[PDB]
Structure formats: C-alpha cells, structure tokens
C-alpha cells in the first residue's frame, strides 16, 4: 500500500543514510574523498532541496489566494485569530518547557571551556510589507551598519525569499478578490487551477524525497568530525535541547490535540512521517511545507481550504522548536557565566524568544543570529555562541521537525474546530 510504502522508504532512507555516513567517515571521510568528491557525494540532497524550494512561491501564493478568497472575511478573520492564538500559546509553552528543563538539568555546570533589537524588528516590519513583489520573490530586507565613529543603519535587499511578505500580500489579495464578487471569480479559478497543478508536481517530488534524504543526512555526518569530543563537551546541553524537543513533540502537542480533538494524535502524526523526516533532512520548514500540505490533505481528513490557509501561515509564524532551543541556549550560557537568573530575566527571555521566533530569515544561521539579539536583549556575553555553533547542525534539524509538527497539529485542530 503506497501510503505505507512511502513511509517505509523514508525510514529505510534515513537509516541507510546514517549507516552510509558512518561507513564513509570510518573509511577515511572527507579527507579520503576530498572536497570535489565530497560535494559530488552530497549533491543529491542539494538537488532535493532545490526541487522543494522551486515550488514554494507558486504553491504559497496560489494556496493563500484561494484560501482567503474562499471564506467570508469575518469567518477568515476568526479562523486566523484562533490560529494565531494557538501558535502563540504553543510557542510560550515550548519556551517555558525549555527554560524549565535547562534550569532543572543545569547543562552549564561542566564549565570545561550584530544587529540590534530595534533594527531587527524594523526589518521584520519592512519584510511584512514588501516594497516590490518581484524582488520579494527572491530577496529580503536586512539592516547593515556604516560608521558615519558613530554607527548608523543603512539596510539593503539581500538574497533569500521573503515568505512573510508574500504570505501577507496573498492573503490581502484573496480578501480583495472575495470582495470583488463575480469579477474576481475568474481570477480565483485561475489561481485554484495553478495551485492544483503545483500539487501534481509535489506528488512526483515526494517520491524523490527518500533518495535525497539519505544523502542529505549522510554527507551531514561525513562533513563533521570529532563527534566524541564534541559530545563529551556538550552532552548536557544537547540532551537538554533534544529532551525538550521530544517532550514538546511527543507529549505536550499531542496532549493538546487530544484535549481539543478527542481523536488519536499519534494516528495523525503517522500520516505526516514523510514531511517530518524531510524537515529533519533539510532543516528548513519552508522547503518541507509542500509535502506537509500534501500529506495533511491526503492522509488526514483536513479540509483543503483550512490546510492551505493555516499551513503557509504557520510555516512562517509558528517556530516552537526554535524558541525552545533559544531559551535553552540562553539559560545554558547564563549558567556558564556563573550569573544568576532573575524572575524578570526569565520573563524577558520567554517573551523575547517568542517574539523573535516569528518571521525567521530562513538562512541556516537565522536561528543562531536570533539568539545574539536575544543575548543583547538581556545582558549576557555573546562569545559563547562559538561552542553552540559546534553542534547547531543537529539542533537546527530537531527544531525544524518540531516547527513543522506544530503546524500540522494546529491545522488538524482548526479543522476539527470548524467541524
């Protein structure tokens, strides 16, 4: 049966990728391979990432326009308000859990070894309302400084898709098309057709997902080295992050889903195994978004409009795992510096992590850079980020899995709420 066949292929691909990476590293690794052969070996994962990122723009734009244009403005507003409330509550719970685990386990007991806040939030506001749509299709506004010796911000458009601005524009355009009446109907049809066509492409790219995922992990454990030393250095911190992610994903979110929707939450999770493993392989929520929409619509009973309206918004707003990681890292650095944490400091770490989780730049370091602003919100040293960079390759993937899982569970919860 194909639904189980794809899951079996994905699991086999992940296991074989880990085994192949360990074998290649044990046979000589990158030194035996060389940089040319290393890039050639990694290439299929890069190809999968390119295929996933190619169809992000038409999928998101058409899906959001169709979803907004298919609901009454009051109903759409209420649905969006409920979705935002769910996202905020889940992010707060994730941050609180991360802080609690970091304080309980004390990963900083071993002691064996940028952009401003206001500019970051102004950049977020600028990215919400893009200056140019075609430019927003592949560029985002970022603030840089010039020493005019007082530094002043300048800002320019740097590479990287502006998903948030496209999402906002698509929602507003769908609302306008709904308001038009008959005149807009044709356009709605057009966009709907376009979206369906993109879905067909996904149904093919999905079948290449396992073969890529294997390589996408194998090279990732071949490029790295000194696994034992890094684990001996940061075992407590890695355990804190991974345990927080596991508790939030396997206990808290399914508990909320069961409380609000009496159905089995793990049966729901079984239907999105492939997008979750794709998120782990790629470490990007936007790239695994199309597969998650496909699985949520097909494997689960979520309605088309609800899924295509909630999942694109959550893919940019809901970042539970990132908030958990940032809170854990901030607390860990606080214990490293022998500096006690105040209750006000806990409140502000929670609030800052939740606020800065929204609208991630999307680059692999985007979370890490975020922590810097966080560590500039409350006075803590920012050099220690170096050791955090030693293992970010795995923590980021663990974060991405949780980011997309929260989206899927929220879509299911809202679908039940409408029912």
Binding site residues for Na(+), as ranges?
A: 314, 316, 318, 403, 407
Q: Are 257 and 265 in contact (CB under 8 A)?
A: yes
Quick check: 403 binds Na ion (CB under 5 A)?
yes
Nearest residue to 404 (alpha-carbon basis) of 87, 168, 10, 140: 87
Whichever of 91 and 299 has its CB closer to Na ion, that residue is 91
Q: How far is the CB of 126 from Na ion (least distance, A)?
A: 21
Quick check: 285 binds Na ion (CB under 5 A)?
yes
Nearest residue to 393 (alpha-carbon basis) of 280, 316, 315: 280
Quick check: 315 binds Na ion (CB under 5 A)?
yes
Range in contact with Na ion (rule: CB under 5 A) among 67-75, 147-155, 314-322, 358-366? 314-322
Range in contact with Na ion (rule: CB under 5 A) among 49-57, 339-347, 371-379, 396-404? 396-404
Range in contact with Na ion (rule: CB under 5 A) among 93-101, 264-272, 316-324, 359-367? 316-324
Contacts of the segment 166-169: beta carbons below 8 A, 24+ positions apart: 166/57, 166/60, 166/61, 166/130, 166/133, 166/136, 166/137, 167/60, 167/64, 167/312, 167/313, 167/316, 168/128, 168/129, 169/130, 169/133, 169/136
Quick check: 324 binds Na ion (CB under 5 A)?
no
What is the size of the binding site for Na ion (CB under 5 A)? 6
Whichever of 315 and 331 has its CB closer to Na ion, that residue is 315
Quick check: 91 binds Na ion (CB under 5 A)?
no
- 63, 120, 274, 318: residue in contact with Na ion (rule CB under 5 A): 318
x/- letters, 376..395, toward Na ion (CB under 5 A): --------------------
Q: Is 151 left (phi over 0), alpha (psi -120 to 50) or beta?
A: beta
Quick check: 90 binds Na ion (CB under 5 A)?
no
Beta strands in 105-257 (DSSP E): 139-142, 145-146, 152-153, 156-159
- Binding site as annotated, residues: 314, 316, 318, 403, 407
Distances (CA, A) of 216 to 57, 142, 371: 23, 29, 26
Q: How far is the CB of 109 from Na ion (least distance, A)?
A: 33
Residue closest to Na ion when measured from CB atoms: 403
Q: Are 310 and 388 in contact (CB under 8 A)?
A: no
Residues in contact with Na ion by CB under 5 A are: 285, 314-315, 318, 403, 407
């Amino acid at each position: 049966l194909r639904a189980n066949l794809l899951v079996l292929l994905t699991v086999v691909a992940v296991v074989a990728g880990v085994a192949l990476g360990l074998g290649v590293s044990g046979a000589g690794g990158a030194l035996a391979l060389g940089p040319e052969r290393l890039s050639a070996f990694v290439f299929p994962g890069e190809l999968l990432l390119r295929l996933l990122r190619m169809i992000i723009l038409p999928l998101v734009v058409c899906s959001l326009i169709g979803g907004a244009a298919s609901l009454d403005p009051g109903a759409l507003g209420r649905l969006g308000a409920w979705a935002l409330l769910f996202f905020l509550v889940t992010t707060l719970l994730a941050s609180a859990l991360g802080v609690g685990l970091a304080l309980a386990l004390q990963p900083g007991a071993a002691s064996a070894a940028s952009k401003e806040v206001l500019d970051s939030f102004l950049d977020l506001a600028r990215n919400i309302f893009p200056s140019n749509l075609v430019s927003a299709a592949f560029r985002s506004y970022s603030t840089t400084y010039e020493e005019r010796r007082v530094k002043v911000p300048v800002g320019q458009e740097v590479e990287g898709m502006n998903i948030l601005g496209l999402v906002v524009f698509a929602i507003v355009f769908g609302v306008a098309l709904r308001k038009l009446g008959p005149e807009g109907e044709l356009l709605i049809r057009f966009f709907n057709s376009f979206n369906e066509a993109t879905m067909v492409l996904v149904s093919w790219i999905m079948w290449y997902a396992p073969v890529g995922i294997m390589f996408l992990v194998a090279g990732k454990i071949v490029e790295m080295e000194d696994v034992g030393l890094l684990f001996a250095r940061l075992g407590k911190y890695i355990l804190c992050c991974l345990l927080g992610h596991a508790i939030h994903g396997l206990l808290v979110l399914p508990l909320i889903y069961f409380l609000f929707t009496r159905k089995n939450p793990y049966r729901f999770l079984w239907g999105i195994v492939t997008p979750l493993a794709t998120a782990f392989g790629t470490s990007s929520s936007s790239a695994t978004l199309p597969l998650m929409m496909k699985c949520v619509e097909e494997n689960n009973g979520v309605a088309k409009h609800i899924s295509r309206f909630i999942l694109p918004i959550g893919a940019t707003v809901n970042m539970d795992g990132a908030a958990l990681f940032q809170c854990v890292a901030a607390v860990f650095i606080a214990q490293l510096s022998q500096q006690s944490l105040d209750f006000v400091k806990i409140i502000t770490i929670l609030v800052t992590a939740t606020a800065s989780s929204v609208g991630a730049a999307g680059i692999p370091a985007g979370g890490v850079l975020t922590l810097a602003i966080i560590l500039e919100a409350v006075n803590l040293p920012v050099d220690h980020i170096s050791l955090i960079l030693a293992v970010d390759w795995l923590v980021d993937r663990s974060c991405t899995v949780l980011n997309v899982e929260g989206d899927a569970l929220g879509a299911g919860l809202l679908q039940n709420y409408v029912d």
